[PDB]
A paper describes a structure:
Two enzymes, peptidylglycine α-hydroxylating monooxygenase (PHM; EC 1.14.17.3) and peptidyl-α-hydroxyglycine α-amidating lyase (PAL; EC 4.3.2.5) working sequentially are the only proteins known to catalyze this reaction. PHM, a two Cu enzyme, catalyzes the stereospecific hydroxylation of the glycine Cα of peptidylglycine substrates. The two copper atoms in PHM, CuH, and CuM (located in the N- and C-subdomains, respectively), each use a single reducing equivalent from ascorbate to catalyze the reduction of molecular oxygen for the hydroxylation of the Cα of glycine at the carboxy-terminus of the peptide substrate. Crystallographic data on apo wild-type PHM and on several crystal forms of three CuH mutants (H107A, H108A, and H172A) presented here show that the copper ions are required not only for the catalytic steps but also for substrate binding and for locking the overall conformation of PHM in a configuration that is catalytically active.
The situation is different for the crystals obtained in the presence of 1–3 mM citrate: they diffract to 2.5 Å, the space group and cell dimensions are different from those of the wild-type and contain two identical molecules in the asymmetric unit with bound citrate. Neither molecule contains copper in the CuH site. When the N-subdomain of the H108A-PHM-cit structure is aligned with that of wild-type PHM, the C-subdomain displays a rotation of ~18° toward the N-subdomain, compared to its position in the wild-type PHM structure. As a consequence of this hinge movement, several secondary elements of the C-subdomain move as much as 15 Å closer to the N-subdomain. These changes result in a complete reorganization of the coordination of the copper in CuM. The two histidines, His 242 and His 244, remain coordinated to the copper, but Met 314 and the fourth ligand in wild-type PHM (a water molecule) do not bind to the ion. Of the two vacated Cu2+ coordination positions, one is occupied by the 2-carboxylate of citrate, and the other, surprisingly, by the Nε of His 107, originally a copper ligand of the CuH site. In the wild-type PHM structure, the distance between His242 Nε and His107 Nε is 11.7 Å, while it is 3.9 Å in the H108A-PHM-cit structure. The arrangement of subdomains in the DBH-cat of molecule A (closed) is highly similar to that of the H108A-PHM-cit structure (RMSD 1.19 Å for 195 Cα), including the position of the single copper ion of each structure (difference in position of the copper atom in the two aligned structures <1.6 Å). However, the fact that this conformation was only seen in structures with a single copper ion (H108A-PHM-cit and hDBH chain A) is more compatible with the conclusion that having two bound coppers has an important structural role: locking PHM (and probably DBH) in the catalytically competent conformation.
Author numbering: 60 to 356
The structure:
């Protein structure tokens, strides 16, 4: 019934720091399949991050391309992401990302963001990637991904604390949140995500981004529903920096990401949602104190 797909780079070798390689893999069937596990084949000393997308039109036809060219032409739904030697990610029973079928993606696209060019003095060839475990047994609970991401953060040099706040109004069919992944680069201290319902903040996740950036389970899994606000804060420092630090594509720039894995009932399910905004900036007046206390490793 099941099968696995090994999505690995074809022996690539970067020639400069912060190089982004992308490749695609066709789903071997067109009928409906479900992704239930993710096993990364990758290490921090070479790879800054991987992202895995579902789509129907990959941005190029070659064995691999530079990701500046695009990931997918159509909507690239994020399935999975990885960074700091995170262990495998396994979905709760009855839950899988839905691919193939009339509705679903026919291609995976893998982005690998390689780190420092030191790791290739060697000139070795790289086969980093993910192995994915699909099943054709229909799952009643379809997983999707909600990405909260900052696009305007400036971290002035040396400032002890900078908060980066992300908030969107939730207006879709009910989702049920069960795991999360936080991401920053070297300046990030703690990253927190919340569901805010009538002034009451309900923790989704709180993690140190310097720990392996796994999909950690949501301690008390929670419904997010029409009318709610989803809110996240990354706490940064400017210490150890000469100039301002901007949001960017290299390991010396910053990023504030919260990835929330959710499920929905098959019939009304959505794959991928996005917040790159801060709609409700004064709402953070009452964010809990825990969002600015660091998690001591
Ligand atoms: Cu990054």
């Amino acid at each position: 019934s099941d099968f696995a797909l090994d999505i690995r780079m074809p022996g690539v070798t970067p020639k400069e720091s912060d190089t982004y390689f992308c490749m695609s893999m066709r789903l071997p069937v067109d009928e409906e399949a479900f992704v239930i596990d993710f096993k990364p084949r990758a290490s921090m000393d070479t790879v800054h991050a991987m992202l895995l997308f579902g789509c129907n039109m990959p941005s190029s036809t070659g064995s691999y391309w530079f990701c500046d060219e695009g990931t997918c032409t159509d909507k690239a739904n994020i399935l999975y992401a990885w960074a700091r030697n995170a262990p495998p990610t396994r979905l709760p029973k009855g839950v899988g990302f839905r691919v193939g079928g009339e509705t679903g993606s026919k291609y995976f696209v893998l982005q690998v963001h390689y780190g420092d060019i030191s790791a290739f003095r060697d000139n070795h060839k790289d086969c980093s990637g993910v192995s994915v475990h699909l099943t054709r047994v229909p799952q009643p609970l379809i997983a999707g991904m909600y990405l909260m991401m900052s696009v305007d953060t400036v971290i002035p040099p040396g400032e002890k604390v900078v908060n980066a706040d992300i908030s969107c109004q939730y207006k879709m069919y009910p989702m049920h949140v069960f795991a999360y992944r936080v991401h920053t680069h070297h300046l990030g201290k703690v990253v927190s995500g919340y569901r805010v319902r009538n002034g009451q903040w309900t923790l989704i996740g709180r993690q140190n981004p310097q720990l392996p950036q796994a999909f950690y389970p949501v301690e008390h899994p929670v419904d997010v529903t029409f009318g709610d606000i989803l809110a996240a804060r990354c706490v940064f420092t400017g210490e150890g920096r000469t100039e301002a630090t901007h949001i960017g594509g290299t390991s010396s720039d910053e990023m504030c990401n919260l990835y929330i894995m959710y499920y929905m009932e098959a019939k009304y399910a959505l794959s991928f949602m996005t917040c790159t905004k801060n709609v409700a900036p004064d709402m953070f007046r009452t964010i809990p104190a825990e969002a600015n206390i660091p998690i001591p490793v």
